[PDB]
Amino acid sequence: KVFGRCELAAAMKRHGLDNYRGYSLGNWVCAAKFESNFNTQATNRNTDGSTDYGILQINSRWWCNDGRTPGSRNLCNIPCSALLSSDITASVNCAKKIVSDGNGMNAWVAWRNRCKGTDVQAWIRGCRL
Ligand SMILES: [Cl-]
Numbered sequence: 086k087v088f089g090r091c092e093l094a095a096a097m098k099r100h101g102l103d104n105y106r107g108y109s110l111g112n113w114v115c116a117a118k119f120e121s122n123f124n125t126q127a128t129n130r131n132t133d134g135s136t137d138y139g140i141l142q143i144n145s146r147w148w149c150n151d152g153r154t155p156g157s158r159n160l161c162n163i164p165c166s167a168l169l170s171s172d173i174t175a176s177v178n179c180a181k182k183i184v185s186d187g188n189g190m191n192a193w194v195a196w197r198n199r200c201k202g203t204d205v206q207a208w209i210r211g212c213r214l
């Protein structure tokens with residue numbers, strides 16, 4: 086599923102991400118835009134052999150099991166394919182664990198390079214929330 090901007094904002098609110106660990110909703114919408122272009126099906130292979138999955142590009146070395154990343158830790162205890170669903174619950178639940186690990190949203194490269202320090206509230210402007 087390719088979400089619209091405001092539709093995704095509403096879904097992430099319904100799932101408790103607004104101000105989760107102090108990150109306002111716009112931060113999460115901005116991260117999703119630049120990680121996946123709001124597409125739940127997005128996948129991208131990395132040089133180390135791991136793969137990133139879904140709307141928030143969650144990595145198969147640490148967070149989910151894809152059966153082809155040797156030494157994977159599977160800290161979210163889920164198959165990576167579950168992160169590609171039109172239902173974002175599994176992605177949100179795993180993201181909550183990632184953002185709590187100590188580095189906050191700096192775990193998402195695109196957030197640090199394209200969202201951090203910008204006017205992220207623009208990503209929710211106009212939306213009925
Ligand atoms: Cl959803």
Ligand SMILES: [Cl-]
Nearest residue numbers: 106188189190
């Ligand atoms: Cl933080």
Ligand code: NA
Nearest residue numbers: 109110111206
């Ligand atoms: Na915001």
